[PDB]
Amino acid sequence: VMPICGGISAARIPTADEKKKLEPVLLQSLYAHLGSKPTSAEVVLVATQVVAGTNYFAKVKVNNDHYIHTRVYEQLPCYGGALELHSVQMNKTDTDPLDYF
Template sequence: MDIKVGAWSHTKYADKETQWICDQVRNLVEGKTNKIYQEFKAALSRDQLVNGTNFLIKVRVGERNYIHLQVYQALPCHGGHLELSGVQGEKTQDDPLEPFNN
């Protein structure tokens, strides 16, 4: 598979790493949205290789409720820290996972 720097990957099912990222930024997301989520399960994701990695993640937060997260992860040589770049609420299972500005 060819990986193009700067291009977003296709949408794929979330894996353990994606769920781990969601778990790490959950408190930031709840603070930004001013909501406490009973459910916070990564469903789908896309990634973009830059000087680090950008992630777009669809997170299930209720029976038919989803939010979209944009998260940046620095390269390991720069500490590998995570930054929450944005949150979009009021999403559905069918909403496409597209980059956004927040």
């Protein structure tokens, strides 16, 4: 009854390869969004939007202190497969819903 294109999966727990995929990218790109460089950035929850490629939405523990939500776009393999940070929702709670933005 529901579309394929653009639908967001249920927020769930990352895999060991999702964390290795995402966190190094978050450590490098988060300063342009947060205005400081994080000392740590932990993907605690992830949800996936099917797109031409994949939008990863993530609940992210920053500096083991607080939470943000991140949108990271993953290219299709033929486009190279790079991952890039698209935007940030700051100042979130640990049970804030991991919703599309």
